[PDB]
Design an enzyme around this catalytic site. Sequence first.
Site, mmCIF file in Angstrom:
data_model
loop_
_atom_site.group_PDB
_atom_site.id
_atom_site.type_symbol
_atom_site.label_atom_id
_atom_site.label_comp_id
_atom_site.label_asym_id
_atom_site.label_seq_id
_atom_site.Cartn_x
_atom_site.Cartn_y
_atom_site.Cartn_z
ATOM 1 N N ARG A 127 0.671 -1.154 -0.039
ATOM 2 C CA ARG A 127 0.087 0.028 0.073
ATOM 3 C C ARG A 127 0.792 1.464 0.146
ATOM 4 N NH1 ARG A 127 -5.441 -1.238 3.552
ATOM 5 N NH2 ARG A 127 -6.430 -2.519 2.100
ATOM 6 N N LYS B 134 -18.681 -17.991 2.663
ATOM 7 C CA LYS B 134 -20.212 -17.681 2.703
ATOM 8 C C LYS B 134 -20.876 -17.255 1.483
ATOM 9 C CE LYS B 134 -20.967 -16.492 6.436
ATOM 10 N NZ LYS B 134 -21.430 -15.686 7.753
ATOM 11 N N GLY C 138 -7.718 -8.191 -1.263
ATOM 12 C CA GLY C 138 -7.998 -9.340 -0.078
ATOM 13 C C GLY C 138 -7.273 -10.458 -0.230
ATOM 14 N N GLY D 259 -12.574 -4.649 0.558
ATOM 15 C CA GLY D 259 -13.570 -4.271 0.844
ATOM 16 C C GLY D 259 -14.007 -3.072 -0.234
HETATM 17 N N1 LIG Z 1 -13.853 -25.133 0.358
HETATM 18 C C1 LIG Z 1 -13.750 -24.169 1.483
HETATM 19 N N2 LIG Z 1 -13.992 -24.376 2.763
HETATM 20 C C2 LIG Z 1 -13.740 -23.768 3.870
HETATM 21 N N3 LIG Z 1 -13.239 -22.314 3.633
HETATM 22 C C3 LIG Z 1 -13.077 -22.055 2.296
HETATM 23 C C4 LIG Z 1 -13.382 -22.984 1.261
HETATM 24 N N4 LIG Z 1 -12.750 -22.153 0.153
HETATM 25 C C5 LIG Z 1 -12.210 -21.040 0.626
HETATM 26 N N5 LIG Z 1 -12.300 -20.890 1.837
HETATM 27 C C6 LIG Z 1 -11.916 -19.990 2.800
HETATM 28 O O1 LIG Z 1 -12.955 -18.638 2.709
HETATM 29 C C7 LIG Z 1 -12.128 -17.642 2.757
HETATM 30 C C8 LIG Z 1 -12.713 -16.287 2.803
HETATM 31 O O2 LIG Z 1 -14.071 -16.578 3.021
HETATM 32 P P1 LIG Z 1 -15.044 -15.224 2.984
HETATM 33 O O3 LIG Z 1 -14.762 -14.392 4.395
HETATM 34 O O4 LIG Z 1 -16.473 -15.507 2.741
HETATM 35 O O5 LIG Z 1 -14.335 -14.139 2.017
HETATM 36 C C9 LIG Z 1 -10.503 -17.935 3.243
HETATM 37 O O6 LIG Z 1 -10.198 -17.932 4.512
HETATM 38 C C10 LIG Z 1 -10.552 -19.515 2.649
HETATM 39 O O7 LIG Z 1 -9.689 -20.169 3.612
#
Ligand SMILES: Nc1ncnc2c1ncn2[C@@H]1O[C@H](COP(=O)(O)O)[C@@H](O)[C@H]1O
Length: 413
Positions: free
Chosen positions: A35, A212, A370, A393
């Site tokens: 950054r 999610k 990110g 973000g």
């Molecule tokens: N198949 C998966 N199962 C669990 N976590 C995952 C999977 N694929 C990606 N991730 C995780 O999801 C992330 C980001 O989640 P989010 O906060 O929704 O952006 C990273 O920390 C990854 O380690």
Amino acid sequence: NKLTLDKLNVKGKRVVMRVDFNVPMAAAQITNNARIKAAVPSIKFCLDDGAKSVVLMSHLGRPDGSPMPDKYSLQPVAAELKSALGKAVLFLKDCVGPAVEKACADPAAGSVILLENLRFHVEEEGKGKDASGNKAAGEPAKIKAFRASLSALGDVYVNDAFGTAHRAHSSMVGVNLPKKAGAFLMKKELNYFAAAAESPERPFLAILGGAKVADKIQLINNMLDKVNEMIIGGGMAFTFLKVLNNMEIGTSLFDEAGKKIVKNLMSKAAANGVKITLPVDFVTADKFDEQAKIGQATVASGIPAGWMGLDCGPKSSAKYSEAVARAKQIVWNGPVGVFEWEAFAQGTKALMDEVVKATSRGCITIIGGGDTATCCAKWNTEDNVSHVSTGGGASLELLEGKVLPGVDALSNV
Ligand SMILES: Nc1ncnc2c1ncn2[C@@H]1O[C@H](COP(=O)(O)O)[C@@H](O)[C@H]1O
Ligand SMILES: [Mg+2]
């Protein structure tokens, strides 16, 4: 159509510049410069074009508006910036007030000044928590005063803080100066995203990963209005596979609220003529741990009770690669597996290889801030893709189709 630095007259002017220096740290040490280095081209442009001064301002962490000079000070950044800039930097222990104003009043020509963490004042975010941890609200008159002080530090304003552009904070929307221009980083970030959100090259492929689904409904929906193809991977995919295919998913992530919208998303993709690529095989783990025993599974075989899918498998890697091969433009937001853990990072690593090859033959490849950006860093592919966003973000809100307060506040062209 917004004013940018290159179109701004800085000769003999004091430049008040918002930068996103909210860098990661660890025991009074910077752990990633990205950054800071990302903002250097703007700082130099100013100096090289005769600016009287460049007053840099940023937040660091979330002090929630109380001087925490012990844990959230921007002082370390001043010494780091001096090394990157190869020029002395005057670090000030505050960012507003009579003395700071006096220091930025008539600086020695060519002066670079770095102010202390803007978030030490509740007026920056406009809200915060007191010492007890209790939420305290900013006062309107204080907000006005705070904004008027920042405005005195320069004759012209430059916002290169892309990472903070989604925030309507004082330093981002409250500087009252006739000229407010987006800097070189901001320019580049908006230039590329203008590609994704307005006139994309085609086919346009969107690769969406993560855990999610509910928090990505708008991101998916917005992208469905613009892409030709969409890869839905990561943990998110399990909500889709469970609902659409009725797949046995073991202890894999499942989004209950999101599962209620899956059929509606697929319906939109169908109407818009979007080809959806979902994973067909996986790398399983007996538990969510970096060293968990690993296995393999397919949508047809299902995932064993207790086990979870943490990465896509070989066949899925093939389909993903095929989508990339067909694309002339790609936007990637979210790795396709648990990239932090080597054993479940192979699908992501393999996909990166394809995206890099795509870029080599002319594909416009845009990596979201990110996690996806972290992957580019880890495997050294920053110089191998078209664009790597500096703000997680901020780029997410853009891909969601939202107006960024920091961009909207800039002057027009
Ligand atoms: N198949 C998966 N199962 C669990 N976590 C995952 C999977 N694929 C990606 N991730 C995780 O999801 C992330 C980001 O989640 P989010 O906060 O929704 O952006 C990273 O920390 C990854 O380690
Ligand atoms: Mg994340």
